[PDB]
């Protein structure tokens, strides 16, 4: 499950 990161470019790509 990927966390709902609202407008932050670095936090979205690190999802495993």
Curated annotation (Swiss-Prot):
Cysteine pairings via disulfide bonds: 2-15, 5-11
Protein name per UniProt: Mature secreted glycoprotein G
Species this protein is from: Human respiratory syncytial virus
